[model samples]
Target chain A: KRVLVVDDEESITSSLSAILEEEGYHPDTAKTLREAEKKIKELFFPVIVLDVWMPDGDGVNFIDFIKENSPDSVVIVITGHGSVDTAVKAIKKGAYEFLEKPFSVERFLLTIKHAFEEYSKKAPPQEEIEFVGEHPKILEIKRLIPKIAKSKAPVLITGESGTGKEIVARLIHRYSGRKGAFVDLNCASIPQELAESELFGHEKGAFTGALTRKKGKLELADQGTLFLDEVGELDQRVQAKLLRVLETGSFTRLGGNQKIEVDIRVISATNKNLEEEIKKGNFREDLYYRLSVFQIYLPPLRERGKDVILLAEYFLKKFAKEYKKNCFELSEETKEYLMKQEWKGNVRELKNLIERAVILCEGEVIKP
Target chain B: KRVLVVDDEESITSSLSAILEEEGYHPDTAKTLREAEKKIKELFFPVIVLDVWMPDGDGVNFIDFIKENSPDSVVIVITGHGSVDTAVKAIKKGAYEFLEKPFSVERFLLTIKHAFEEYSKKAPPQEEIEFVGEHPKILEIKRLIPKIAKSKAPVLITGESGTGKEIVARLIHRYSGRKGAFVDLNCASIPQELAESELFGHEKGAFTGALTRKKGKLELADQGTLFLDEVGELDQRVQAKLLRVLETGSFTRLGGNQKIEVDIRVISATNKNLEEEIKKGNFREDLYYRLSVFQIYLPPLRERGKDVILLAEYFLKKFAKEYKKNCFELSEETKEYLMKQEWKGNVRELKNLIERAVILCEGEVIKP
Candidate 1:
């Protein structure tokens, strides 16, 4: 694991780097904020040891820069003064740990060890991206995920409800190597009056009951992916505003004058025929073209034959552990019942069924 | 006003008829449930004086028939025995007034007089449907409302946000002559999981959270209008269920086998292009054709030039009374300002602007 140590003092940087290296970390040293930023941009560092006071700028303010660049980095703030105000400020700005300059090397190494462990835990497990089905359609989708991740074009996923559109989106996000987050917004559940605020964020007092300033999904998904679920449900006004943001990569918060910029890869999912919406004047054609630069259509579950058994087994194993149950496999009769289902709700419905079976099953095998 | 007095006793019917005639009501006497049903089907009555213990069916049950035929008719349940259970049942079934047979003529006449007054108030005032704008588009929409109401076919209303689609629906319902209550469900506001339940209802224990039996919007809107707002946001499953209901005029509650029938005029409104949704497989083509038997497209507020001033004045008067403000007229400059702008939110934005101006204005004149 690579750990970055930034300090204006040459002696402190050298000492910290030596301790980190001794603790089995490949440590890099930088003596100024500018140098630290440049290093972070070029490489992904799991841990960052930063000093609050530097000739270039406040290292606490640099946390925002690090967040935008290497989002997974756990920043540990080291300061000589260790004032309570600066300590709280650093922590609030997302510092993993605050250490005084005079602290022991033992304490410093322990903190670094924890930060590396936490960083490793932050990523999703590899098996989450595993496509469970051997069906040709599913195999094709799995193959396409990696290729789709290579590009930053907006993707539109069209499918019936309960199809794994969201899982595919997660897979794309996982493979894309985006350092930020996988933020999702369900448009169908949002009220029209609040949809704009949910997408663009808003300043305090933006509207009634807006007690505090809020950061929206777009901002949270900066440098990553924004999965708009049920995107066809978005209001026309919000659609136009979203199109503008996609074009310029910038927008103002509700009741705020200053513009905020973010780099987000949008992936929208809907079962609606957008071309029909465009004809009926419900959706903008330009927005549709922008959102659907790349499109993936997921077939309904009933079409995926024996894949249901594979999914059922996967869910059975998963829920067996989750509920601390004895259930290990679906009975032959259960498998037959699973395969015969129309699976109207698709993967999600199967998952729920398996979950219920696992919860109620007293024996090792789940029956129909 | 015609008052129907239903009683099996010839002496009681004659006495009630004489009293109703003296009170300036044209009294119609029905000796049994069958006779009362025939009279109600042929003629509209404001009040029905019903008596229990008739040779025919229960008068309490007859309230449902009257509600289906002449919805505005108020039933005054008069009984000689006056058992508590029967009285409660009559009131639960929508009896407006419950009177003992031994009560004086003064109380009986007072109850009938009050029912007639309440019925008159139940119908909407003449001015609510008054189209405020002199614009050709506004005039055309107003003219179309009555004609659209005359047909039992479904109507699809398309317009931008705040374009008064709901008001158009209300106007159609007011003119339709159907006695059922006007019911509306906004697809955007409902969760996908609940959309089906809201439209088709459910029996007790239908699902985990369904603790009691519930009536759906279709049953409530029977023989009247059912307005589906933001129709494009409906999930694929709900859309299919809705299409089936539209075709067959019947549906079963969740977890219930018996089918319930309703005769409802569906009026759907949306800001999205549904044809685009059809092409995207978000909406069904057959359902589209069924819902769009008559389509009404409302133009954005910006397209109707000077109508902005007319809307501004209308809102000014409305809010002036509502907020108890002194505002009466728009300033000459305000009128000019109103006419020279793009209303992105359509009439809603203009209405909000006028409401704000009216609330803030100290004097009679409103300024920009």
Candidate 2:
């Protein structure tokens, strides 16, 4: 792994450089943006740690430039006096992560490891997946996800039910450092009585149905990503337990004597406004803030504007290639219907509709 | 002037109440928002000093309720931690003012006096004066201004030229209780050699051009608002002096033995992008953030959507009253033309255009 450290203070740069070298990464140092820019031009770094306040420039501007010019670089922003607004802005502008100064070495190394894994995945032939859609809105979202994936910060993804938030979460896991299994739990599916056991697992004889020791989602996602889908539907009891795990990364399994510690990145998806939940006191404010350290409000299909057509075409091509079909065109009537009809279910509904159309269509043109 | 002092700590509240009463205000005491609300219901107070993290609820929520119910109530929020985010949010939430704890009694009394004058001017009257636009964005800006105004910290207002930044600054000063005057100095207009002396004042025979002692904007706006318009145009020499004033609030005026000190509120407006200027080494980053304690971005008329019409109508009515003519109505064609044309110069351009249109129109219809 290659690491880049940027700071105006020589002592800070030297100390951090020493630490990075000890961590088995080729550490590169830059005292100013000009020096950093020169280094960036010469070689691409997997992870870049930048100071928010630099003598030459603001690190946010440098992060933006790197994101635009070298999309694969993971840039972590460090600030002395951090604010939520600045953190939000930095994340929005494609920062891989943000760390407040005086942060522990353990946390710093964890963040860098996460960033490097993300950068490596997108660097070459490791992942050749092509994300279609040329619309600027869709492209912007595609560009943002990689940066979001590089951070271990819990993310709240909100969109209409079918807006592919789950897919986004999966992508984040694939890009993240953990090579472990991706465990997804649907908060809505679990019964209120079984929610706790389902999340934290249970020991044998813990309950009537607790036959043996079982690993919970928290344990299952050890050193990996745990995706909580429809998280807004989580019951209050479960929310309390979830908040505990999120804060301490440790939880006691149901009826178990041992408290299991795990390293996991939590990425939650929901269609509801958690803020409203907080105001109603249904959700804990601190937990909401913790889960929403990073947020991605996915644009609904209708609001994606012209990207709708582009997405339709891309789906059509993918389905055609998979099914060995030759139907190549969407009829004018079909296009009009697709654009005008509100896909209330979002991307999921569109994907299903496209699959159905591919199987049913008999001619070159797919008519509505 | 009427003042309400609220704190959960009885000792602190009693002390504050006694101090304020000694200062000659009709001071009431409240231990919680419920008590404050009851007191407000019985008789509206012009000023309120509130503890932010109250036991019942946060002070910001109370400030919002008060601002909505009693627009004239000037609320000063106090917090112990003094975080930038909380401070910014409190100000943005329509706090009439804010003071960090450990503040002097003198500063507290002065803030109350300032808030009192503001409340009296903004108090409700029978006639409904449209405080101007109904556009959600514009209303958001309107709501934001008072919050920004209440802070003694310096503010940086940014927008395109002719975007009514000065009007926003004036509104902030008016609502913030700087009742003395709004003193403005255009950095671009002042001569390079005289800029320091212009801002810092001078003694007799201080320089070659000295004929008489002169009080600069800083001295002139004591206990008032000192607005630096076109602050980005400040020369390097002037920037250093301004930075010193911002840091220490004490400066030796030209050849003066006594170091001058002032309690003036500094509000600066700039059209240039200071971040970019900082990158180019043309502007100091420290100074930029210092002046931008609470930055306000004034969106131009074109970006503000339908607010152009609202502002135009506002200007039209004001001009009509000034010229002793009936209120002029814009023709449908003129309104359409106005909305379609890109307002490069924003509200200032619209104001000038309306003034001219009101003069040239034959009757009540304004023709473009």
Candidate 3:
């Protein structure tokens, strides 16, 4: 349990550090805001006792920096009675608590204790997942999802377009029982210019249009799952950054120096052959090796025999109710037609066809 | 020049039709709400005169249908004195004008004239475009952009990934001087299940998540440009729907019977070989034929010769300013190293590299 006490006056910081050390806590001291910044960049501090006035700048303004960088750290503002308003402003800006100057040792220790408790609050459990396929391969995948969820290892799901790779990723996340929100980033959808900022977040005034501090997907997925769809589309720079995060479990926001630590399970999916992407110099070999430690391959619809009819019937019934139509059954000829044709787009193509049929059909039987 | 009069009472419909016909307008009359629905579906009407109470349902509820089907048509609600509250509701729902049941002929004529004026308001001109390349192919593309913008013809841009196809598309849209907002949809980013509703929009209660009526990109791009990035990723159903909209400037929202019309310029880009996709039965040949009436192919960065160095320098300067770094110039060795690479990712790859270098460099020059 380490704590950082920041103040411009050596007398206060020294006393605070001595008090913390006597209470069995390892404490660091910073006399200026600049020194505090440097210390924050180097190591993690679970609790921070801050002075509202620093020689370089107001510590009230430093709350955004601390929150953006060391998200898990709890901050306690220590200020003079004259600067109580500034201390309140610090609290609103995300400081955990405040201590007025001329405070007693008992009050100081209690505040620090509360800050640590707030910093280490336990995460709640998450929900489960659902799947709709009956193929043997799908059944194998269903069995693997729960096992994969129980582990903290990264998962890479691969398949052709429309093969339900995202579905499997969602299944893993839901079953993982993680407390944080499940955040998904579709790599193909993001422009190359914004890729890094999208994944790792940025500090206030970090760049133009970054008027306020914002948390990135990686930070938001702390203690939860991050589904990186179209993982093959990540640019080279992003790949390097992501690899570092996977290896170290810590990263700073854009234009920030303080390291923000996270505990997240990354679930990546892609249709591309990553090995080929690596050979082509588009992907990093080490990153690919890291991600593919646990691989799940989704079978295309054509290879999943009898599953086609099952999915078609499933979609047929689903669309019928959705459209408020009475087309309850597929015609005998329509069922034969569905079985004879190639489903190139997989389940999505079948779903679309059934939805279109339900809309057009006025009778109980839907014909192709 | 056409007007539709919808009222359950024949006397009111007949007189309204006679008044419109005398004013040199072709008039159609519907005696029931069902008859009015059929008439609206069959043809476009510049104006609609509706009765608040109909035998089938409240005409106030029909405003959404009228607006969705014939967006250009102005709706005039007529109601009894006791139901003025309903007329106000109709106005709030989207009625252009409301009048009492005993409204004067002069008032109705003036309201219709104002509606026509509002309907035909001229679109404000759009802005100009900018480009940063001296290559002959780049110059040729810049020249062609203005010419393409002058025509309503659909443009298909072909290039390798990371080539500035969207830049060229945006340039055309800006130069076209359209009044509607420029909208972009990345086909690869959207799920196959939501493609149709995403492009064509959906009615309230159309799907489980569609709790409110929503307009899609097509509607939002009315009188503007719709940039379809990664156009080849569009599913077959969406492809067919787009083809129909291209052939006829009309389509209905998902789960909606009313036909909505739009006037939009479509500029599409793709890195995939659409011809091969067609041969593989993934794309529609006729839609491809229609889209390729105007084509713009961007050259890869490696083929652009000295332009590579120009882009590198441009990005170097840009990032130096954005990052507030003193790395103003690239080393001679770095410049030489830049030109030798394939630049498979094109302009985007170059930009990302410069940004990374600017962040890392401590000296005045960036090294390889």
Query: Candidate 2's error at B301, in angstroms?
Result: 0.6
lDDT agreement with native, every candidate? 0.78, 0.72, 0.78
Return the DockQ of model 2. 0.01
DockQ metric for all predictions: 0.01, 0.01, 0.01
lDDT of 3 by residue, B6-71 (tens): 998878888888988899877888888899888886665767889888899879999988876555
Task: Give the per-residue Cα lDDT of candidate 2 at B60.
Answer: 70
lDDT of 2 by residue, A1-368 (tens): 56778888876688878878998977989899989887775665657888877778777778877875445578888877434356546767888567665555554665576576445332111344545455666678778888888899998898876677877787778777665556788776555566677678776557786456665777677667889987777788888889988887677777655444567899998888889988998788888888888888787888877667777777777765444456768887778878896866566567656655665445665555
**Candidate 1 chain B TM?**
0.69
TM-score of each: 0.37, 0.34, 0.36
Listing candidates in order, what is each one's chain A TM-score?
Answer: 0.68, 0.62, 0.64
Candidate 1 per-residue lDDT over residues A1-368, each given as its tens digit: 67888888878888887887787878898888888877876665768888888889877898898877666578888866436467557877887666655655654775676576555342212245656888898888888889998689989999987788989999889888886678888786566657788887776578887656666778778677999998888888899989999998877778765445577899999988989999999889999999998989898888887999888888887766533457786788888777777866577667666665664567766465
lDDT of 3 by residue, A49-126 (tens): 888878898789998879865665789888785556786688679886776666656557755765765554423222
The better-scoring model by TM-score among 1 and 2 is 1
Cα deviation of A83 in candidate 2 (Å)?
A: 63
- Among all windows of 10 consecutive residues in model 3 chain A, the one with the lowest summed lDDT is A121-130
Docking class of 2: incorrect
